[PDB]
């Protein structure tokens, strides 16, 4: 199926306490493969996926160098942004950045993106065409104007439509064994009496990958989306994911409800009846 490579960057200022905390992570779909943490002892980009060790010595040297350059840019920006919003130098502020690319089943470029945020809100993002910018407010406009003159869009486009895709393929191949695998969810249903005349049915999905999944309850074949509780898909810690969805139903009418599980790891969606 389709695939993506994405990098996430976070810088938190600590005025007077130390350098801003800088954390970066790289992903191929839902699999993290590298990380950098300014508080760590290595001060190098580190591996987080077995297959990334297939890369050579120059890879680690280069990615360490580049990631430190990102850290430096984030450090300057924190200052710049503080000024733009006329904020005090004592407070702690955040800068987040995410960029990457998507490829189809043939592993050819589909889309690219580069987003930047300040204190948890959109600040500026590269639009879908990879040639223009969406500036959140008046502050972002100044950066927009700066980045147009410096032809930043052009740099990002070349990377997003080329380098990003090239490496994503490379990683996809080296990690074929696992990245191109689909772990269909192991599912079951629990029936637990709650009220005196009501029962709760919880639909479980476990040990699946990628994290993308859909659990929907139906009654007599009709979607029931207003008497249910859905949890945020969560990481099992071993590479797989988990999720569950429940609905309170009238005791004795359980046979009317069905849980539908959609996951690319399944030939066809699963229908579960207690």
């Amino acid at each position: 199926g389709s695939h993506s490579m994405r990098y996430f960057f976070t810088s938190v200022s600590r005025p007077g306490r130390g350098e801003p905390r800088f954390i970066a992570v790289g992903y191929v779909d839902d699999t993290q493969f590298v990380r950098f943490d300014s508080d760590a002892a290595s001060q190098r980009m580190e591996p987080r996926a077995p297959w990334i060790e297939q890369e050579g010595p120059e890879y680690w040297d280069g990615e360490t160098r580049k990631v430190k350059a990102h850290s430096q840019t984030h450090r300057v920006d924190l200052g710049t942004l503080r000024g733009y919003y006329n904020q005090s130098e004592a407070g702690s502020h955040t800068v987040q950045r995410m960029y990457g690319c998507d490829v189809g089943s043939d592993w050819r470029f589909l889309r690219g993106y580069h987003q930047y945020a300040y204190d948890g809100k959109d600040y500026i993002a590269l639009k879908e065409d990879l040639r223009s910018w969406t500036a959140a407010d008046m502050a972002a406009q100044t950066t927009k104007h700066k980045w147009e003159a410096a032809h930043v869009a052009e740099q990002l486009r070349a990377y997003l439509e080329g380098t990003c895709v090239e490496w994503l393929r490379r990683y996809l191949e080296n990690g074929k064994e696992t990245l191109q695998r689909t772990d269909a969810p192991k599912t079951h249903m629990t029936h637990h009496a709650v009220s005196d005349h009501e029962a709760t049915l919880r639909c479980w999905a476990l040990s699946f990958y990628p994290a993308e999944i859909t659990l929907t309850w139906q009654r007599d074949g009709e979607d029931q989306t207003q008497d249910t509780e859905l949890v945020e898909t969560r990481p099992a810690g071993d590479g797989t994911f988990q999720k569950w969805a429940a609905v309170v139903v009238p005791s004795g009418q359980e046979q009317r409800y069905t849980c539908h599980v959609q996951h690319e790891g399944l030939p066809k969606p699963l229908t579960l009846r207690w």
Binding site: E63, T73, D77, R97, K146, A150, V152
Partner: peptide
């Protein structure tokens, strides 16, 4: 692989 550098805002 990362961008070779990110321009300052």
């Amino acid at each position: 692989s990362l961008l070779m550098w990110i321009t300052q805002c």
